[PDB]
Structures are given as C-alpha cells and as structure tokens.
C-alpha cells in the first residue's frame with residue numbers, strides 16, 4: 001500500500017527532448033518523428049520578449065537561423081511554421097525513439113507528469129495537477145521553457161503541457177502541444193496574475209474513496225444530495241463545481257466501495273460545513289485535491 | 305521558483321528492468337551486463353516463504369527453473385548465485401542498454417528515486433528518503449518486489465535499494481544491491497516491526513529554508529539558540545540531533561537567505577513546542593523531513 005505523488009516513467013519522453021536555440025536564446029523542444037515543437041518565443045531576443053510581434057519576428061527568420069541539437073548532435077532544420085504560441089520545426093531526421101503519442105488538452109484537476117528539462121536534458125520528474133485557475137504548482141528554473149507534461153496510457157504518450165511562464169506568485173503557466181495557453185495568459189515578458197484558485201472537488205472525493213477503500217470511513221454520513229445543490233454549496237467554500245464527466249470518472253471508485261457519488265458528495269458537504277472535529281483522513285487534517293480518481297485506482301492497483 | 309518532491313529521469317533504469325519467474329512466483333529483476341539481480345525469495349514457494357533455508361532451496365534449483373523475460377524476448381539463464389538476499393541470474397546476453405552504474409549503500413536521511421515496477425515494466429517514479437529506522441515510506445503493491453531505488457550523478461546511475469517487504473505499519477523495507485537489508489528486517493513471511501521512527505532534523509531545516517526561498521516566513525522569529533539547547537529540545541520530540549556537519553551542509557541555504565542555521569533552529573524549536581496552529585508551510589500541515597539540503601539547493605539555487 002501507501003499513497004504518494006507518483007510520476008509516469010519518463011524514459012519515453014526523455015528520448016524526445018532536444019535543445020532549440022535562436023541567436024543566444026535557448027530552451028527545450030519536443031522531437032517527435034521529423035518535427036520539433038518548442039515555445040515560439042525562442043526567436044526573441046531579451047528585448048524582443050517585452051512586446052513581441054511574433055508574426056513579424058518570424059518572417060525575418062529562415063530555416064538556417066534555428067539550431068536544434070539532440071545532445072551535441074545537430075539536426076538540420078528544413079522547415080518551420082508557427083502554430084499559436086508553439087513553433088514547429090521540420091528536421092531532416094525522424095526521431096528513432098519516437099513513441100506512440102498523441103496531443104491532448106487536459107481539463108482543470110487532471111494530473112500529468114512533468115519532465116523538467118534543461119538544455120535538452122531532463123533533470124527531474126514530478127506529478128502536477130492543473131489548478132482550476134489554469135496554473136500548475138511546478139518547480140522550474142531558467143532554461144526550463146519547452147519542458148512538457150504528459151500521461152502514459154498503455155504504450156501511448158499523451159502530451160498535454162509545454163512550459164512557458166512563471167507568474168509573480170511562483171506558480172507556472174504554459175500551453176498544450178498546439179500552442180494554446182491554458183488560462184488567460186500570453187507569452188509576453190510581463191507580470192500576469194491568475195484568477196483566484198479553488199479546490200478540485202472531484203479529486204477530493206477520489207481522496208475520500210481512497211480513505212474508504214483503506215478502512216477510514218468515519219466521515220460517511222447517512223444523507224444524500226442533488227448534483228445541483230452540492231455545486232451551489234461547494235462554491236460557497238471555494239470548491240470547484242462538479243461536471244457530469246466528474247461523476248462518471250468517479251464511477252469505478254463508487255462501484256468498488258458501493259458508495260454512490262451523490263452520497264459521498266453529501267459526506268464531503270458535511271465536512272465542509274462542520275470541519276474535521278479534530279479528526280484526520282488517511283492521516284491528515286488537510287483534504288487532498290491533487291489525486292485524480294485514476295491516481296487513486298492506479299495506486300490501489302498498480303497498472304503499467 | 306517552486307519546490308516539489310522530484311525524482312530523477314527513469315529512462316536509464318527502465319531499460320534494465322526485467323521479469324523473473326520461478327514456479328508460481330513472479331517479481332522484477334535488474335538486468336545489468338550479463339547478470340539479472342532480483343530478490344532471492346522468488347525461488348521460494350508458499351510453504352517455503354514462512355522460514356526459508358535459502359541455501360538449501362537454491363541448490364535444488366536449475367538454470368531452467370528461471371524464466372527471465374525482457375519484453376517480448378526470454379533470456380536464457382546460464383548461471384545462478386546468491387549474494388545475501390539478492391539472487392544473481394547469469395544470462396547468455398548482456399543488456400545492450402546497460403548504463404554507467406555502481407552499487408552504493410545509502411545513508412539514513414539521504415534520498416533516492418524509486419522506479420515502481422510490476423512484471424518487469426515500470427509504472428511510476430517517486431522520491432523516497434531512507435528513514436533513520438531504515439524503513440522507507442513508499443507506494444508498493446503485490447508484484448513490486450525487485451523494484452529498485454537509485455540516484456543519477458552526471459551519466460552514472462547509483463543503485464542503492466531493491467524492494468522486498470511492506471511492514472504491517474504500511475512502510476516498506478528492502479536491501480542494497482549487495483542483498484544487505486536496510487534495518488533489522490529479514491526476508492521471511494513474518495510480521496516485522498521497525499525501531500522507533502525519528503525525524504530527519506537536517507532535512508526539516510532545509511525544507512524550512514526552501515519555504516523561505518519561496519516566500520514563506522510566518523514561522524521565523526527574532527530568537528536564536530545554541531546547537532546543544534536546540535538538540536535538547538529536538539531529541540525530546542524524537543528528532544535526530546543536529547551535527548556540525550549538518551550545520552555546515554546547510555551553509556549554502558543560510559547564505560542565500562541570510563538566516564543563520566541556529567536562527568532556523570530557533571524557529572524549528574518554536575514550531576515543535578507551539579505546533580503550526582492551522583497554518584501550513586509549502587502547502588503542508590506537517591514538518592516535512594524527506595527533502596535533503598542538496599534537494600533544496602538544486603531546486604532553489606538562483607531563485
């Protein structure tokens with residue numbers, strides 16, 4: 001047993017990380033087949049990033065202005081195009097380590113693994129949750145842009161995040177692999193502020209199902225509730241409202257424990273309104289919200 | 305900026321994990337060069353695991369009794385030996401993906417990355433610390449035996465742990481790659497307790513420095529303490545004593561923040577006597593002790 005913040009094995013993503021450089025600006029890129037994906041601001045000088053006109057900055061760039069390196073080995077750029085805030089660079093070599101992959105735009109509350117990369121070399125792996133305000137509580141240093149977030153189902157790597165920005169509050173913002181930012185952020189060198197964050201309700205409920213599975217079930221009450229009533233109450237406590245998809249992904253945990261989702265909602269609502277009464281859940285007085293229902297099942301039944 | 309429990313990239317280890325089956329028992333193995341290391345209880349049966357005479361059970365085994373699968377290929381075992389609790393399976397093929405590696409014995413309070421594997425296929429990576437009582441608080445299910453813990457220095461993988469056991473308390477026990485258990489544990493099917501679990505003081509202080517580097521300072525105070533007077537209080541709370549080496553290792557963090565180590569100790573002493581009320585540090589409601597000073601320096605340098 002045991003419950004930990006767990007990342008996916010990073011080997012399949014490691015073989016795809018490369019370094020992209022324009023002039024002196026360097027960051028990370030994702031090499032899949034014969035295309036490298038990286039943040040478009042690599043074409044900016046330090047001064048350009050303050051108020052960049054990317055369309056104009058890109059028209060002054062040719063394939064030969066782009067330095068793409070796998071390690072110290074260069075991959076000649078034979079084509080380039082801009083898709084939203086991501087740059088796509090066609091290279092003359094298909095990545096022999098390209099895994100089965102796809103690009104996905106995740107929802108708030110969903111978790112993914114981040115391969116922290118520097119100069120095209122991953123340095124650490126850790127799991128992140130997309131906060132409801134479209135930030136992630138990551139750990140990123142200078143030169144980390146281009147780091148990607150991913151999940152692995154079966155043998156297919158689903159890329160969902162590429163790093164771009166650190167906010168003044170210390171949290172982080174980025175895009176999907178199609179260059180579309182998560183949240184209302186832009187790739188400018190400007191102090192941008194995210195919206196007020198909230199607790200990921202679906203993940204809190206998954207954490208409660210995790211407790212029940214392990215014999216910690218003192219919090220189960222005899223009431224039930226409607227989805228609408230719970231949402232209205234949940235927002236009064238800074239909790240995100242549940243969707244139909246939330247109820248459905250809680251299905252397996254509901255069937256495994258025999259506790260209907262709306263019953264657990266009624267239990268969680270009582271915890272929100274009355275507190276923990278000096279008690280703990282899974283050895284904690286804090287309600288954990290960065291464990292998705294899939295993380296709970298995967299850690300109560302290790303799948304690979 | 306930011307601070308997160310973070311493991312090393314697992315690619316180099318993934319290319320080394322294999323599946324080892326003996327009779328009706330399957331677990332993970334580590335394929336380096338022409339040898340596959342795994343827990344020796346894979347040779348045991350249901351009745352053997354209760355009190356196995358491993359030397360007795362091992363000699364009655366043949367190379368063909370061992371099914372070593374590396375993906376869709378089966379490796380031919382051409383030799384079997386035993387080094388303490390680690391069974392060594394010689395194979396006719398050397399692992400092409402063998403990286404630069406060494407076998408090291410981790411010290412208590414030090415951290416390592418764990419590649420949790422099942423049926424020779426890794427499924428998750430997370431960081432652990434070797435607790436003073438020589439257990440680790442991991443996440444392991446049935447079939448996780450053979451999983452390894454490691455660190456990576458440059459291009460060298462330092463293997464330091466192989467998983468064997470989950471104690472009745474939910475914690476986990478294992479060996480180094482020489483088959484020597486961490487702690488007073490034994491690879492038999494018995495319920496085993498560990499010593500009293502003390503807190504890794506130097507790690508808690510590093511983690512306090514990380515909180516300051518990241519904008520958290522509500523726990524600081526104007527007071528200072530001597531090393532001994534802090535250790536008096538710390539030991540009273542089942543905290544490991546702080547040594548001058550620990551003080552020295554914290555230097556970089558103290559310089560970066562401008563907070564003397566003994567000033568942080570005065571803060572920790574207050575936290576231990578008053579508690580945190582309802583407040584949290586770096587999002588946690590407890591004092592985290594599984595971050596080493598090096599972990600903090602690596603994530604907070606320049607921040």
Ligand SMILES: *[C@@](O)(CO)[C@@H](C[C@@H]1CCNC1=O)NC(=O)[C@H](CC(C)C)NC(=O)c1cc2c(OC)cccc2[nH]1
Nearest residue numbers: 444445446447448449468469470472491492493494495
């Ligand atoms: C390996 O997977 C075994 O091949 C591993 C799995 C454990 C159990 C689920 N999570 C893990 O980490 N180890 C064992 O099953 C181990 C086998 C050898 C004898 C060392 N035994 C235990 O972990 C074990 C035995 C007992 C026990 O007795 C019976 C009473 C309480 C707890 C306990 N754990």
Ligand SMILES: *[C@@](O)(CO)[C@H](C[C@@H]1CCNC1=O)NC(=O)[C@H](CC(C)C)NC(=O)c1cc2c(OC)cccc2[nH]1
Nearest residue numbers: 140141142143144145164165166168187188189190191
């Ligand atoms: C990339 O590595 C640069 O390519 C970098 C990642 C950060 C470095 C430290 N931690 C990180 O996550 N990204 C940036 O530097 C971006 C670049 C934009 C998209 C052009 N900008 C910021 O992170 C940034 C700018 C400002 C700011 O202004 C100036 C004010 C406050 C915060 C802030 N962050």
